Amino acid sequence: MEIKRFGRIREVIPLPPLTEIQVESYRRALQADVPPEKRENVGIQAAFRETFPIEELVLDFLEYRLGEPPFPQDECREKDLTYQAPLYARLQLIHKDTGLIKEDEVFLGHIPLMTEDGSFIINGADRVIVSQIHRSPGVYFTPDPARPGRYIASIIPLPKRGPWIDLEVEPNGVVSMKVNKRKFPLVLLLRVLGYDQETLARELGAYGELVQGLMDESVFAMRPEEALIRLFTLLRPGDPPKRDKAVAYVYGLIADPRRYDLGEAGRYKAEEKLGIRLSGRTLARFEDGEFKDEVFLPTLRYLFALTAGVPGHEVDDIDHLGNRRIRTVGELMTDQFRVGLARLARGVRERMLMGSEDSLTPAKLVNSRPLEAAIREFFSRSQLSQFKDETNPLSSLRHKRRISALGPGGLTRERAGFDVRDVHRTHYGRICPVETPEGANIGLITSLAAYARVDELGFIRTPYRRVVGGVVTDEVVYMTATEEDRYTIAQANTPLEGNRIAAERVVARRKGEPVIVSPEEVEFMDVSPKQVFSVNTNLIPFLEHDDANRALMGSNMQTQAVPLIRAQAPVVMTGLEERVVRDSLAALYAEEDGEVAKVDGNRIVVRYEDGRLVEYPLRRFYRSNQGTALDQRPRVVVGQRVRKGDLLADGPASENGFLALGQNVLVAIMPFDGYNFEDAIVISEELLKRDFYTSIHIERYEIEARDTKLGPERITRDIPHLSEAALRDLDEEGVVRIGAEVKPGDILVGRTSFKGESEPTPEERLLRSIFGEKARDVKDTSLRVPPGEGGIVVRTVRLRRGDPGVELKPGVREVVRVYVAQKRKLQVGDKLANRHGNKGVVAKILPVEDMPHLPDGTPVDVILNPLGVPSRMNLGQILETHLGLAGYFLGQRYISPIFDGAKEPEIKELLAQAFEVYFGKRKGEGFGVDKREVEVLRRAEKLGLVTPGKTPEEQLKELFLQGKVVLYDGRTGEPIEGPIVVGQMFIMKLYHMVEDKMHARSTGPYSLITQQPLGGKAQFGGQRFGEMEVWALEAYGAAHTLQEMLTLKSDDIEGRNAAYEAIIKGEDVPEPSVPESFRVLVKELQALALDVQTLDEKDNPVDIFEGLASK
Amino acid sequence: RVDYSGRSVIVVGPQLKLHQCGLPKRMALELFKPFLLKKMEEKGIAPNVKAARRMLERQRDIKDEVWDALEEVIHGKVVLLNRAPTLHRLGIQAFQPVLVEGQSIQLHPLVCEAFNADFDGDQMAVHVPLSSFAQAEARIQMLSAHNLLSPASGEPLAKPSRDIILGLYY
Amino acid sequence: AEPGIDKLFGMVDSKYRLTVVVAKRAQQLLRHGFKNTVLEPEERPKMQTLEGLFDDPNAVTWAMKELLTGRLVFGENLVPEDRLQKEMERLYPV
């Protein structure tokens, strides 16, 4: 097939590595491939350097090292282990008095390593560490919401490191400073720094009526030490004002490099904002025996200059992406590594003063557990540590480019507000204005733009083409938001002849605001329209013709696309479809030029230019996190000569290197007997026949045989009181055979456990005595198939205890897992959707003869409702249908770049060329115009769609150019009374299927305290009848239906047992008793020492506990 | 959280009458499980309740006799369809269930305006009124056809929309 | 819609009273095995089965049908409850 593309825009630079925000960050934080002697001070190295040495015996740090993983990646996924590497640390114990030096290398545990694609493996599960976005450290000046002419000064350090400081001018004239919920005159703190009335008079004297409030004679009357003691009495009431104690607190609060830490970014931000330079990252210093100032004087200078109205002093936008930065995986892990290392340091200081003050070694003195616990905590129960989205390659790819404002140090959901949730002008090229969850996290969770990358300070930079005069240089400059605000940046689609600007008046941007400007005033230019949106948003063709809301849907749903077995690339692409499967490690390519030796379903062997033989094992039918089968398929034959970067094996959801999230189906936009009523969708049975929209899903079933005080749990083929018909597909060890078919109720793995000790009821004793069979010692607890599930067993993993290589958690004897897969065809209820935001469920599967069809006898695949189009305002799918139709008969695919894609007249041209193949075939076969085509044409020229008088061929062409063709109703044979738009549309099958969702429950598990039914399909729980549903019944006046829900159908124990008994006996349900949950309320209120009594009309106490609560 | 309550994806049911809704046989089997047990014992599909329930707990042990028995079970009986959020009293409505092949719930088009439910993947819950009293309340007060006007404005709440308006206007 | 629902709403002062009457009458019928019915053999609600048409198992249908006939008496304080129960078990053993 031929691939024709459009667009006049030549984008210089290709998109950066999409997973670079993960890999390049983590590696930069580790420096494991960097020689220890040549290591810089960052991440893990910076953590060791900042926590060392230990003062009081002196323990010092030399260098660290990381060994190789104890197990490979797939072995960790298999054995539920963690992908990590051993961490060793060179330490020398030095006695500050004796001079004794004892050196040793201690083991600190393991550190989780990042895979190639940028994810992790935590205890056998792929996990993605999502980057965090927060307010950059530094000094900001925000207008006081109370007093119009007064402003609030804020000094912000790194999260968890140091308190926030607020400088505010009070109505009483004096400037105040706020630290740790404590306010005091800033004058005192300035005095401690060694400042005098002289220095402040010459420095701040430029602004009158301001510094006089800073002037206080009672402050200068005391020495720096006295003022320091005075300040300590202010911050620490009740605590004895000892000199060295006050020094320790204040230094630790401000000048301490270890406790208080500005960001290296925040350091630069403060330097550029205050027009100064900072030696360290602390607000002050302890030098030559006293405190020396760094930050406080320039900040107070800027503050007073701001209040006075002095030019050159602005407020700060805190949603500005020049004041907002990103904490990647490396920095987040480093910060938690710093915390755990600090706790280890506390253990060191503690153990030095204990035990032998003479005989100690670095090994004895070190406890690795705090560090291990901290790292393990961050990689497990952290919020930013998420379950990897392995639905399709695009899912995980986007997941690694996610940006969260939540997590530790971030925003609480209630602390959010929609000021941060909005889009800023600085989001241009940096953060996608489209992609976001439409849930409660809208605005908080976002995706990174394509061409955007994150610099070392943590800010997001975007590329821009250099423009001097009229010439546009091929060089590119990545800029921050603050830097971008300086220049005038034109559009990417501005006319260029060669490297020279053609237009007389170009469209440009000055600080986000659009401006028509001359080419002589153009400083820079957009690299590409693609940089404005995320990766997913770039996969949507004709994006400029869609509403922003449905575009959000399209970007989000492409993440939800299940990899089909017959999945194919879209007929209308944007060009990034291949690159996605490139950056994502789904596909497989050749490292160098060479020839293919072997080709198999399991492996691909290739001989290169080097002569060396490289064998690539193929991942086949491996269950992902969501259940979507991930397998690689060979695309080369034996002896095929390939080159550098050529396709070897297509991964999941990939076709010839291109991304395949769905299938190209022949669609028809028309109402159909109300079966497409309200976003509903009608499909053809042919889609099931040739297995379109069919995908394989695997599910993991685990069971544990443990040690009980009542006796061991044994996995065996011996299960008491069972028929041989049920033990059919099991082997002799109790495991089901590989390849068998399992249905709900069947036994996957049989297991026996000894019965709990209990007097068998006299009925049971007699029953045993009658049947002449002694009661079995054990009891059946088998892993069976959950209702609504099943399939074919493809694998069985059996781990035990006593056998080599495997040791389970304490108490557990053997762990057995069963992998059951299934091929899922498209059925009524499953969710289909396109890239333009059009979504819906399959409401009907018509036989092929009922389906609306073409004059040549070709039936359409999908019937979409035209009513879904106008209100939703997404016309992209219309153009996709048009160009899809032209490409259907021409037999060629297309590439239509976003905003640079194909335009209508060119589509009309391709439609005309397709029409020649359509009708020219007919007239060549000796077939004239159909009589029904005549009537359709008549009603068409009454519709003003075709010009009257012209020959039917000319009219049919006039319709075909409009994208409309003549359709015949399969049920009648009569045509549709009008021409209908028909063409190929790229439609995906989403992850939401009725097979995963449909659930029903009669009776089941109840909670412990409340004794109400559980929730969810997984727990076989009941549906929640909220207080709103209670209102609905109340508003209706249905009392006995509501009383049912409140008692018999949920919380009433005696009532529900008698109810079930009544129904199976054919008897009517009994009168409902008092709910158990109210009894819980009564006793919980009694625990609060509050007497709650139920009474009658005689005001005499009524016992709802029936004597059980009274003595 | 209550017993005898299921949940599945909704699908348009143009063929249904205003007082009807489509319900999967699987859901109906579990939702009416005790009723199905008694009716099975009434017939010759199983000697008693215990054996009948043991029979249903395995899918391959199910034969057509239990389906036709279930048909006799739910006859005349109605269920309650609920769609969150429940903003007013028509958020819950009574329908006579019609057993269908598939795992989806079929919902009558005209009540989609009352539930404010489209078919872009919406789900619904199915509650089963047990007592004769609860059954009478649903069939009379809460029945879909018995509620045609809005208790808010007095205006028709269940009226032609979308495809229907288009066709008649055409 | 339920057959002749408008007539039933016209029979009572409030629609909820109708619901109570139907429910209680259906309880009497379900308990006494449909032998206390006022419905003539031709008025018996049927059910289509694979075998043949049997009686409608739903007692609520019987109750609303009996109410349509007008052969029933509805009101309050018409008879001692214990008397009504034991008399209905006398005429129609359960």
């Binding site: - | 007060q141 | 619901t19 009457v21 206390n36 008399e87 209905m88 005429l91």
Partner: peptide
């Protein structure tokens, strides 16, 4: 969890009784 005082739970319509004419006459004459 008691019966709500509205609709079928209202004392106005709650205590209504049903009786067929055959049983009606049976208790009347007795």
């Amino acid at each position: 969890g008691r019966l709500i005082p509205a609709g079928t739970g209202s004392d106005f319509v709650r205590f209504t009784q049903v009786v067929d004419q055959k049983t009606l006459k049976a208790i009347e004459e007795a």
